[PDB]
């Protein structure tokens, strides 16, 4: 995340997926070396929303890191679309518009998968 307090910048929004992941990584590389009550109020809720989104990366085992892969069967009811179909014919904002009727259910399912994964290695 690229801000004075740290939060991601829109690196190359109009770029289609296959280049935009590369620019997400180069976003990271340049971003961390680039790093009256209105200002205080705004950056306190910036802290609050930041710690919120890092707790979403916290409770999926992702520990506050990008490109964090977890083990969920991505249902064809959420999207029947093929990989290269969306990953070379689309950008990211219209795909978030596509699946904004599922994001609470996706956070639901990744949380059962993370607690299931840690409870199973808690067994093993």
């Amino acid at each position, epitope marked *: 995340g690229l801000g004075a307090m740290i939060f991601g910048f829109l690196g190359a929004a109009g770029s289609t997926m296959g280049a935009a992941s590369i620019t997400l990584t180069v976003q990271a590389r340049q971003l961390l070396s680039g790093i009256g009550i209105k200002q205080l109020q705004a950056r306190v809720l910036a802290v609050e929303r930041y710690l919120q989104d890092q707790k979403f990366l916290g409770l999926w085992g992702c520990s506050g890191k990008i490109i964090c892969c977890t083990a969920v069967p991505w249902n064809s009811s959420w999207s029947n679309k093929t990989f290269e179909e969306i990953w070379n014919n689309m950008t990211w904002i*219209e795909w978030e518009r596509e699946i*904004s009727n599922y994001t609470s259910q996706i956070y639901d399912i990744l949380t059962i998968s993370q607690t299931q994964q840690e409870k199973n290695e808690k067994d093993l």
Partner: nanobody
Amino acid sequence: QIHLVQSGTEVKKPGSSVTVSCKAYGVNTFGLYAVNWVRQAPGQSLEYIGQIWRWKSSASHHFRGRVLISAVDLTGSSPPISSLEIKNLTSDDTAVYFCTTTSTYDRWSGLHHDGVMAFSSWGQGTLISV
């Protein structure tokens, strides 16, 4: 609020050409709003024809190269007005026509999707007989 009217009911000759207006009393522009031209055969269900959407005129492959749509937005005496024009009205073109504006500003509302869109506020439908 938004309201739509258009031209009246016109009956013409086979092999004529027709134009149908679209006066949008409430559209702040047709830059951000988009309008849609939809036919309806007598009794038969409604069929899409064409649209204007950020000043890209389009019609269907059932209407490419024969039917033409225009739009001039908000001027002084005139509200934003589109217009559907058809040459060579066959007996198939005997239909009720429709103009409808959609709000395309807040991109995550879901009334629209990348050119195609759900049609917010209709007019009165115009009979055209051949």
